[PDB]
Amino acid sequence: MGSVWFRNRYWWYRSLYDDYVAREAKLAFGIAAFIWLPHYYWGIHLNRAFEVNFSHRNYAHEWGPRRNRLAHSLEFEQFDMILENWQDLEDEYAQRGD
Amino acid sequence: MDTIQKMNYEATVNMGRQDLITREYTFYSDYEFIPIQEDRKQQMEDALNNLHKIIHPTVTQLKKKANVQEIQDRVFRKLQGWEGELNTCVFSAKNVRDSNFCADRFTNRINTEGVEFVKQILREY
Amino acid sequence: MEVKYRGPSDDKLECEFLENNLLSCLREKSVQDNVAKMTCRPEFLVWFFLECPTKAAVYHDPKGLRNIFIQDKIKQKG
Amino acid sequence: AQTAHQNRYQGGLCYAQCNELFSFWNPSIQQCWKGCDFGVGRVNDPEGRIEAQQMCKRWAAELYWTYKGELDTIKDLRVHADMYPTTPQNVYRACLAGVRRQKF
Amino acid sequence: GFETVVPAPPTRDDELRMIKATEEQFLQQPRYKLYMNEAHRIAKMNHGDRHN
Amino acid sequence: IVLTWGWSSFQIGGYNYERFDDNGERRNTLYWKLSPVEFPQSKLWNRPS
Amino acid sequence: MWGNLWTEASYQLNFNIGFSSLRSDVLIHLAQWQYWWWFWFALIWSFYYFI
Amino acid sequence: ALNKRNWGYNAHYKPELERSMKKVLYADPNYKFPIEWPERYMAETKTLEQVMDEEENWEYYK
Amino acid sequence: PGEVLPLRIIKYPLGLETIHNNIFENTNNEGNVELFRLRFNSNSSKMQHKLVQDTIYLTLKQKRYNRKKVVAPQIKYYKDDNGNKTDLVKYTGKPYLSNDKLLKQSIYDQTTQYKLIKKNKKRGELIPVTLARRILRTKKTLVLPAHVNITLITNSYDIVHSWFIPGLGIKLDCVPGRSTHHTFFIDNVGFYYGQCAEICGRYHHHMPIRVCALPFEHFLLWWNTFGLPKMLNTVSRKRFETHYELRKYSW
Amino acid sequence: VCGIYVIHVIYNYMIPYYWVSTPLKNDEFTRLRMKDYIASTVLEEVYGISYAEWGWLPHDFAYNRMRGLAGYMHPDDPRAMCTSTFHRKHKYIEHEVEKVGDYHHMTYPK
Amino acid sequence: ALFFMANTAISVPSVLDTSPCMKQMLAYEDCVLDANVPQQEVIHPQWPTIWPRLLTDGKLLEFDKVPFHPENIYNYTYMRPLTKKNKQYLYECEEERFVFKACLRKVISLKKTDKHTSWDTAEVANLQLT
Amino acid sequence: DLPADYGKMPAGYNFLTRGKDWREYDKDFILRTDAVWEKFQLEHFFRNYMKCFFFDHGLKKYQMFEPEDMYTVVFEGWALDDLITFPGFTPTGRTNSYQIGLSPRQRTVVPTQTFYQMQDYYMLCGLRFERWFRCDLVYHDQRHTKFDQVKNQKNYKTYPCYREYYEAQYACQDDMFDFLMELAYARRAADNFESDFASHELTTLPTFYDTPKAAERKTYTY
Amino acid sequence: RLIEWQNESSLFTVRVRARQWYWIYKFELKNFTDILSTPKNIGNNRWQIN
Ligand SMILES: CCCCCCCCCCCCCCCCCC(=O)OC[C@H](COP(=O)([O-])OCC(O)COP(=O)([O-])OC[C@@H](COC(=O)CCCCCCCCCCCCCCCCC)OC(=O)CCCCCCCCCCCCCCCCC)OC(=O)CCCCCCCCCCCCCCCCC
Ligand SMILES: CCCCCCCCCCCCCCCCCC(=O)OC[C@H](COP(=O)([O-])OCC(O)COP(=O)([O-])OC[C@@H](COC(=O)CCCCCCCCCCCCCCCCC)OC(=O)CCCCCCCCCCCCCCCCC)OC(=O)CCCCCCCCCCCCCCCCC
Ligand SMILES: CCCCCCCCCCCCCCCCCC(=O)OC[C@H](COP(=O)([O-])OCC[N+](C)(C)C)OC(=O)CCCCCCCCCCCCCCCCC
Ligand SMILES: CCCCCCCCCCCCCCCCCC(=O)OC[C@H](COP(=O)([O-])OCC[N+](C)(C)C)OC(=O)CCCCCCCCCCCCCCCCC
Ligand SMILES: CCCCCCCCCCCCCCCCCC(=O)OC[C@H](COP(=O)([O-])OCC[N+](C)(C)C)OC(=O)CCCCCCCCCCCCCCCCC
Numbered sequence A: 001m002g003s004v005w006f007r008n009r010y011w012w013y014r015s016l017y018d019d020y021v022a023r024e025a026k027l028a029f030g031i032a033a034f035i036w037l038p039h040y041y042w043g044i045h046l047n048r049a050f051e052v053n054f055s056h057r058n059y060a061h062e063w064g065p066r067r068n069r070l071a072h073s074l075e076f077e078q079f080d081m082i083l084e085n086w087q088d089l090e091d092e093y094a095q096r097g098d
Numbered sequence B: 001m002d003t004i005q006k007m008n009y010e011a012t013v014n015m016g017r018q019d020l021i022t023r024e025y026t027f028y029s030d031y032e033f034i035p036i037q038e039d040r041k042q043q044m045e046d047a048l049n050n051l052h053k054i055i056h057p058t059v060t061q062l063k064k065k066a067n068v069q070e071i072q073d074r075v076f077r078k079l080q081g082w083e084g085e086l087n088t089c090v091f092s093a094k095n096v097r098d099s100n101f102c103a104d105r106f107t108n109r110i111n112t113e114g115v116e117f118v119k120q121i122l123r124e125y
Numbered sequence C: 001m002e003v004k005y006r007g008p009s010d011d012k013l014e015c016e017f018l019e020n021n022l023l024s025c026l027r028e029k030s031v032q033d034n035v036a037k038m039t040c041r042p043e044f045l046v047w048f049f050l051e052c053p054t055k056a057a058v059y060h061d062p063k064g065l066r067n068i069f070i071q072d073k074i075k076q077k078g
Numbered sequence D: 001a002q003t004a005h006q007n008r009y010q011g012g013l014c015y016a017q018c019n020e021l022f023s024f025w026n027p028s029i030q031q032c033w034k035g036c037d038f039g040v041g042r043v044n045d046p047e048g049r050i051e052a053q054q055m056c057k058r059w060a061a062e063l064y065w066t067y068k069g070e071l072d073t074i075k076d077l078r079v080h081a082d083m084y085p086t087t088p089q090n091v092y093r094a095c096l097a098g099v100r101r102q103k104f
Numbered sequence E: 001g002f003e004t005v006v007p008a009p010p011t012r013d014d015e016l017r018m019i020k021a022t023e024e025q026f027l028q029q030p031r032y033k034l035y036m037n038e039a040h041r042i043a044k045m046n047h048g049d050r051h052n
Numbered sequence F: 001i002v003l004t005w006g007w008s009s010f011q012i013g014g015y016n017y018e019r020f021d022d023n024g025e026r027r028n029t030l031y032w033k034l035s036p037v038e039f040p041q042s043k044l045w046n047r048p049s
Numbered sequence G: 001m002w003g004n005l006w007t008e009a010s011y012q013l014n015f016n017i018g019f020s021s022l023r024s025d026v027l028i029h030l031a032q033w034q035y036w037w038w039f040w041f042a043l044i045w046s047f048y049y050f051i
Numbered sequence H: 001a002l003n004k005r006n007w008g009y010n011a012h013y014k015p016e017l018e019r020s021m022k023k024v025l026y027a028d029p030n031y032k033f034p035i036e037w038p039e040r041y042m043a044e045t046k047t048l049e050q051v052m053d054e055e056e057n058w059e060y061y062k
Numbered sequence I: 001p002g003e004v005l006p007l008r009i010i011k012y013p014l015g016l017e018t019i020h021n022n023i024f025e026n027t028n029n030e031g032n033v034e035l036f037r038l039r040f041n042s043n044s045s046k047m048q049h050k051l052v053q054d055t056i057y058l059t060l061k062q063k064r065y066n067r068k069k070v071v072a073p074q075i076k077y078y079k080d081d082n083g084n085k086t087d088l089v090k091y092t093g094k095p096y097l098s099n100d101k102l103l104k105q106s107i108y109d110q111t112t113q114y115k116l117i118k119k120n121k122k123r124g125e126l127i128p129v130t131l132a133r134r135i136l137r138t139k140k141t142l143v144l145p146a147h148v149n150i151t152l153i154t155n156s157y158d159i160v161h162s163w164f165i166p167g168l169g170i171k172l173d174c175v176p177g178r179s180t181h182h183t184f185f186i187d188n189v190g191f192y193y194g195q196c197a198e199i200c201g202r203y204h205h206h207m208p209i210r211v212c213a214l215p216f217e218h219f220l221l222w223w224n225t226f227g228l229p230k231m232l233n234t235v236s237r238k239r240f241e242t243h244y245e246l247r248k249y250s251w
Numbered sequence J: 001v002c003g004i005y006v007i008h009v010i011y012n013y014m015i016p017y018y019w020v021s022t023p024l025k026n027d028e029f030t031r032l033r034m035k036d037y038i039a040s041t042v043l044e045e046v047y048g049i050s051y052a053e054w055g056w057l058p059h060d061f062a063y064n065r066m067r068g069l070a071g072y073m074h075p076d077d078p079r080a081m082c083t084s085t086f087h088r089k090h091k092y093i094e095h096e097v098e099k100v101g102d103y104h105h106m107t108y109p110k
Numbered sequence K: 001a002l003f004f005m006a007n008t009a010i011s012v013p014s015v016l017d018t019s020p021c022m023k024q025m026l027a028y029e030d031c032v033l034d035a036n037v038p039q040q041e042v043i044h045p046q047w048p049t050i051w052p053r054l055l056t057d058g059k060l061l062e063f064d065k066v067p068f069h070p071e072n073i074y075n076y077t078y079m080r081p082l083t084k085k086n087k088q089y090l091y092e093c094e095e096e097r098f099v100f101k102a103c104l105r106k107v108i109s110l111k112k113t114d115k116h117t118s119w120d121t122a123e124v125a126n127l128q129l130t
Numbered sequence L: 001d002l003p004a005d006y007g008k009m010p011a012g013y014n015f016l017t018r019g020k021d022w023r024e025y026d027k028d029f030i031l032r033t034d035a036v037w038e039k040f041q042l043e044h045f046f047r048n049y050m051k052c053f054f055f056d057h058g059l060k061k062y063q064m065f066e067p068e069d070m071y072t073v074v075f076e077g078w079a080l081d082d083l084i085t086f087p088g089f090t091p092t093g094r095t096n097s098y099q100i101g102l103s104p105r106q107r108t109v110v111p112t113q114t115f116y117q118m119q120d121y122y123m124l125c126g127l128r129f130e131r132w133f134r135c136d137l138v139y140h141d142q143r144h145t146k147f148d149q150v151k152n153q154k155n156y157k158t159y160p161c162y163r164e165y166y167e168a169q170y171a172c173q174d175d176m177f178d179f180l181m182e183l184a185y186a187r188r189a190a191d192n193f194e195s196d197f198a199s200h201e202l203t204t205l206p207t208f209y210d211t212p213k214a215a216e217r218k219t220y221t222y
Numbered sequence M: 001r002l003i004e005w006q007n008e009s010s011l012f013t014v015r016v017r018a019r020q021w022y023w024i025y026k027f028e029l030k031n032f033t034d035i036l037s038t039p040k041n042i043g044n045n046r047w048q049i050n
């Protein structure tokens, strides 16, 4: 990586900035190979959180009205059952005639 | 009538009565001319209706708007020359007699020359 | 959308209003709205069940519904 | 944007024919591409072609407000270079042209 | 001026013939001539030939 | 001072916040599926904003 | 507060450091981009530390 | 054939219940829908009286 | 100027309306399409009526919150007010919204509570902006639907302002003489506050904004019950009128 | 690079502005659209949807797909014509649309 | 850019619907849409009982002391009684309606009892975790 | 075998299921093990989401107010104003709970593509108002005679310039529209048509669209 | 791409005017019909206009 790919390493060092920081540039790899892991894993967690949030937004947008309509229909069905019982009672009352 | 019906009727009548209230306001410095008479107005409308009757079949048969636009532009150029003549004659007219003479000349010129020109151009199309 | 939890109110006046609306709706629907004027509120019908579970259970109960019908007929006659 | 391909080059000869049919600044090319997509796999069938035409009708109706019978009473179904998708009739005509240009 | 008779909508055979003609024209188009696909491509090419 | 604290402080803080505070979730909400998600810490407080 | 539906979108505290809200899609995208911006400085930071 | 798609056209009800009457009515080739799919999304032109008269005079194909 | 000439010949525009594929829109009584019109001038020395303003806008004025000296009780009078107003009082009450979302009759002095909270409210070091809205209170919050595009046309009366909503991250510069159009899309149900982000003068600091994006059903309810009636209040205003309008236009 | 960009900006925006400065009798709208197409359809603010997965997650991708379809539904839009299609599935993983073009509405992707 | 986010959670699936009679409701709604009845109340499975007049007169509201000024076919759609065509195409959808009503009645009949012990931790069974 | 009239509605058929047995439909639907929990959650969510109104112990009615911030709702619940009776989401008690989309667009006479590059739309507003005024100069005085503004509203015809008017209104802000309306009033009072003043076509450069045969210039194809 | 270039495709139009020192929101009359003609999503992702 870097100077090793060049067969004139002196030219590689001279033509960029005429400066030598190769020691630090090549000793930084050891630290950089592990300095990133906590950030990477926390970023994975945060990306999963964002994905869950997007899925929840989609599900709400698509199904919230459907759930509300289902609940409304359920309550209407309860009223329908009560109405059928009331009609039976009214028919019995008409037939008897207290 | 209901309140809504009354409001709608009031709005319609008020919208129609704009000229009623606009008449009362007039300007002193104004080159007032003699308006064209009702008889001449009706005669010119009848001439225009005759031209429209002559033009109706060809334009209805035509399916592209470009040809209709060309016919309209040519007829409008002719009628606009005649309209300018009528306007300059009537504006200077000093009496209803002169106004009627100008209107009669304009309508006769339509009925003859404009009819012939419309027939010619329609046959060309 | 975050919606906060709240159990049925069971407020006395609110449930009385909802029960009156339900009774009116039942009376009209029994005759199929063959009345001079209509006073049905299906939205309030839904809210009755949503807010007053106790009265809904009473109405579902065969004995409770019978008693309610008898009381309603007595009140209408008187 | 509403077509079936990421870029016009992905589309076959139908997209090139649409580009030739309409001028480069005329957005009826997109409607022609929609017609191509509708006609894919249907032009070579007598019923498929009619189905594609009905799909064009539905597409125009959903794109613009339209009344019943306008598309049936359209006088000329031909399209010229400077025809734009400003009306349901123009959208329908462009879609039909795309269906015609579609080969397979 | 006067309008010509508008032919009825083409059948599938007419569509195929038109597609073949368009393909032939595209193939005939020279490679070194850079003209975009558009309604005015052929007119532009004729103008360019006259200009040359 | 330079590397380990700077590259691990925010992540440690977010992890502890999720552990001990439910990432600041406001409870009393219904139907988590429909409810919005209270994200974990994402703005680096240690980095210059 | 539209009934029991809490429509309030910002619950920032006195010492807020982040965005006022994260419900908006634009703000979510900006926050994600800002968080991942600092992830790509590991080699540079290590090199500067060594220097 | 592989790339052929319906693109949302004529996406009417597709019955799943075995005994739904639609599952046989749609199979029946001589089945007329209440309105054509393209017209289902277009504004009505007939007046209310005309529409009511047409619906009253309408006769089921069977 | 120059006087209206006695007669004008006007070409009827063609192709403006594409409905039903009809080039001609004017047909004479005899059944022939009209290509030209004759317009005649009478009473030349006459005024010309001004164009009638046929633009109807439902206008909401969002201004900073105004302090209340006294919390007036809710009073409702009898209907059928054929006169200027009915002196008789039907109902008078002091409702307050309890934690149970019920408007219960208050057993305290509302004005006293208002004064006490105004003077010596309890705050904290970490208090949410939701519970601390000191400089973010207005009236007539702007209600929009959610999950749909809206075209916002921004402008100013006097000088340049900035409509700023940090919650949505939306900043629109309202400049005089411009009609800048913006696309507005809130992908969630939420209530957002905002401030002005452009120096304007005396009350640049105090000029808040409140925008509530709600599900379309709630937005439509709010529209029908608050905004639509005002759009005809300019001419017709009554409870029966509002009922008629809401029954006539039902979604 | 800056000079080439400025030259392109000039060609698209500055010189064409002077082509039309008065009402035109014939094909006024056609000529106005001709001069406006080159400026309003620049790739800088059009290209990118082909690689939308770089910023849009699967669920976010589906939501933004429906949003973009709604936004660009208008037929008269050269920018929409030049924009990449929204009728496609997220390359990584798709959760909403199983097959492209199998919808219940020609406009709504679902 | 290419992998600026550095990770994508493809595992997180689209949350699955868990409502009792959602499929039945959607089937009935699709059948009604195919029927193409201008009235909207038909969306409710118990419309013939909730609005009995919809089959005889169509007057669902009492227009007393309130003007009634229709302007087109879209003004008072709920005031028009169902015609023969609409009645036929709704009868063609009775099987779905019966199933939907049966599911609703079963859900109503089901009631909470002390026997249930996982009620508090029902979210896991509802699959709210991802 | 089917009776050859399967699906036909019996004469006099009534949409009533008063005495129907629902046991035969048990096998046609599937309920998950947490059906009771789902029912309770649905009820809770509907109650806490759809209820934007509050019952009042004084008027025995439901009242509501415009949306307010949490601070106003909480710390000023005792100080509320503009309470209005709750009229219901729909007149007939149906449900407005639906997911909405974008309606089909309106056909355009003056395309926005003329000046779509500019976000200000001032040029587009000017052009649209100019076209609307061109139509108005023709149709303005007949509006009360043979158009929507007739007293007999039964036989009314829409104003021809309605679409141009609405497009101009959309493109123009109210203040600019007022300026242009003042200009339109002045121009109508002067009775000035752009045609009788226009002479810039002589100085405009030629183009293929200026060919003397405009009808024949266009080429049509299928 | 999401928050711009979509003026032509909007449900309705609202005019925001800024004055010294308040705001004014105007809804044009066409917004009433635009809201009245909003499509409804019913069934398995089907769209209806009433
Ligand atoms: C305030 C404080 C805090 C900070 C705040 C924030 C500050 C923000 C500031 C922002 C500023 C922005 C700008 C930042 C940039 C600044 C740069 C600057 O100013 O300095 C200029 C600085 C000048 O250059 P340089 O960095 O000094 O150049 C030195 C090279 O980088 C170094 O490399 P080199 O080639 O010169 O020397 C190394 C080479 C030299 O060593 C050699 O001799 C090569 C030997 C190769 C063979 C190895 C294996 C041999 C095995 C033999 C057998 C073994 C025994 C048997 C075992 C068998 C079984 C085990 O050896 C290697 O390490 C190469 C190994 C290859 C790696 C891949 C191998 C994978 C396979 C595994 C193989 C090995 C393990 C397996 C072993 C066996 C397993 C079986 O950088 C630049 O030139 C410009 C940098 C611009 C960025 C882009 C650069 C891209 C080009 C590449 C360079 C990338 C690295 C350098 C990047 C810079 C940072 C580190
Ligand atoms: C007689 C002679 C006189 C002298 C003559 C002198 C002049 C002529 C000289 C020679 C001939 C040159 C001809 C040039 C083109 C002529 C015009 C033409 O063809 O018609 C237009 C035609 C328009 O494009 P199109 O065909 O419609 O394609 C777009 C469709 O979307 C379809 O797109 P697609 O998906 O199919 O792929 C297209 C993609 C093709 O892919 C690439 O370009 C790849 C580039 C990487 C290098 C590729 C190297 C070759 C392939 C790899 C190697 C071979 C394979 C592997 C071999 C391995 C063997 C071991 O290329 C692009 O166009 C992508 C960039 C366009 C958008 C960005 C524009 C720049 C604004 C700044 C960016 C920010 C906005 C966007 C944000 C996006 C975020 C998601 O071509 C173009 O001009 C396209 C653009 C060409 C490049 C310029 C624009 C991008 C430049 C970016 C880098 C430079 C910096 C930018 C400035 C600001 C920086 C801060
Ligand atoms: C982040 C992970 C890494 C991703 C890979 C990124 C690199 C991709 C490959 C780029 C190749 C093209 C480079 C163009 C610039 C060349 C400039 C130059 O002077 O070259 C002439 C040089 C000439 O060198 P020379 O020494 O023979 O001669 C020059 C000296 N005089 C003048 C005296 C003759 O040719 C090369 O050596 C080419 C090297 C190409 C590799 C890049 C070198 C820079 C350091 C990074 C190494 C990356 C290795 C990647 C391996 C593959 C991975 C997929
Ligand atoms: C100040 C001195 C000015 C002197 C000159 C003024 C007189 C007019 C000169 C006109 C020259 C026209 C040359 C056209 C060349 C076309 C070449 C070609 O094939 O292109 C094809 C392209 C694309 O068309 P095409 O490719 O579809 O056409 C096919 C072309 N052939 C036949 C070759 C295959 O043409 C164009 O894009 C049109 C012309 C573009 C011109 C761009 C000008 C850029 C100007 C930058 C700003 C300069 C500001 C200066 C300010 C000065 C202030 C003092
Ligand atoms: C060449 C000069 C370059 C200078 C570059 C600029 C450098 C800027 C950064 C400087 C940082 C200095 C050190 C700060 C340490 C802060 C530790 C802390 O509170 O935890 C933060 C973080 C914050 O996480 P948290 O979990 O505590 O809280 C997060 C916040 N909430 C909960 C609200 C969400 O915690 C940790 O890192 C926990 C482990 C800490 C282990 C190390 C403790 C060190 C204690 C101080 C040093 C020892 C005392 C004697 C020092 C004598 C010195 C001579």
Ligand SMILES: CCCCCCCCCCCCCCCCCC(=O)OC[C@H](COP(=O)([O-])OCC[N+](C)(C)C)OC(=O)CCCCCCCCCCCCCCCCC
Binding pocket: A032, A033, A036, G039, G040, G041, G042, G043, G044, K001, K002, K003, K004
């Ligand atoms: C001719 C021009 C090039 C062709 C056009 C390329 C356009 C498309 C790509 C542009 C954006 C590239 C960056 C993507 C996001 C990642 C950024 C990043 O890691 O930077 C931090 C890094 C350095 O920061 P770092 O040290 O923190 O890197 C991460 C370290 N770990 C893994 C430990 C977490 O940037 C660099 O200095 C290296 C170059 C960028 C990474 C390249 C990886 C190889 C991919 C091939 C590159 C060659 C071009 C082809 C690209 C592939 C598609 C064609």
Ligand SMILES: CCCCCCCCCCCCCCCCCC(=O)OC[C@H](COP(=O)([O-])OCC[N+](C)(C)C)OC(=O)CCCCCCCCCCCCCCCCC
Binding pocket: J001, J004, J005, J008, J037, J038, J041, J042, J043, J044, J082
């Ligand atoms: C010596 C090698 C020569 C290599 C050949 C290429 C270089 C030729 C000389 C320089 C000019 C390059 C112009 C390329 C683009 C031409 C067309 C154009 O502008 O429109 C396309 C695009 C514009 O596309 P658009 O948005 O107008 O799209 C048109 C199509 N519609 C309307 C449908 C969308 O141009 C740009 O975006 C320009 C951006 C500025 C940066 C351009 C960099 C070009 C590549 C690097 C060149 C480096 C040259 C170095 C020379 C010296 C060293 C050797």
Ligand SMILES: COC1=C(OC)C(=O)C(C/C=C(\C)CC/C=C(\C)CC/C=C(\C)CC/C=C(/C)CC/C=C(/C)CC/C=C(\C)CC/C=C(\C)CCC=C(C)C)=C(C)C1=O
Binding pocket: F001, F002, F003, F005, F006, F007, F046, F047, F048, G045
């Ligand atoms: C990866 O790790 C990294 C990060 O992640 C955390 C980074 O963020 C960063 C980014 C950081 C930076 C660019 C640097 C940011 C800045 C930093 C760290 C410096 C901050 C310093 C401070 C907050 C302290 C300020 C200093 C002070 C002296 C303040 C005063 C304090 C004290 C105790 C003294 C008080 C005294 C007085 C007020 C005066 C009293 C006395 C007198 C008047 C004198 C009177 C005279 C007589 C004679 C008696 C980097 C570089 C990094 O590597």
Ligand SMILES: CCCCCCCCCCCCCCCCCC(=O)OC[C@H](COP(=O)(O)OCCN)OC(=O)CCCCCCCCCCCCCCCCC
Binding pocket: A033, A034, A037, A038, A039, A040, A041, A042, A044, A045, A046, A048, F004, F005, F008, F011, F012, F015, K130
């Ligand atoms: C004071 C400083 C001292 C020095 C530093 C010491 C460390 C201090 C603590 C750092 C911060 C840790 C906590 C915050 C980051 C981790 C967050 C985390 O783990 O989040 C969860 C995430 C995956 O979970 P997810 O699926 O997204 O969410 C649902 C969870 N059921 O998790 C993941 O991404 C999965 C992780 C799996 C286990 C990884 C084990 C790594 C082992 C490394 C070995 C050595 C290095 C090897 C490197 C190889 C590559 C080069």
Ligand SMILES: Nc1ncnc2c1ncn2[C@@H]1O[C@H](COP(=O)(O)OP(=O)(O)OP(=O)(O)O)[C@@H](O)[C@H]1O
Binding pocket: B064, B065, B066, D082, D083, D084, D085, D086, D087, D090, I015, I016, I017, I018, L107, L108, L109
């Ligand atoms: N009144 C209009 N309403 C809508 N679009 C129009 C109108 N006038 C013109 N256009 C648009 O401008 C294009 C060119 O208009 P032009 O007047 O040349 O058309 P035409 O001759 O009537 O026939 P065609 O519709 O076939 O182009 C039309 O295709 C249409 O895209």
Ligand code: CUA
Binding pocket: I160, I161, I162, I196, I197, I198, I199, I200, I201, I203, I204, I207, M018, M019, M021
């Ligand atoms: Cu208004 Cu600053």
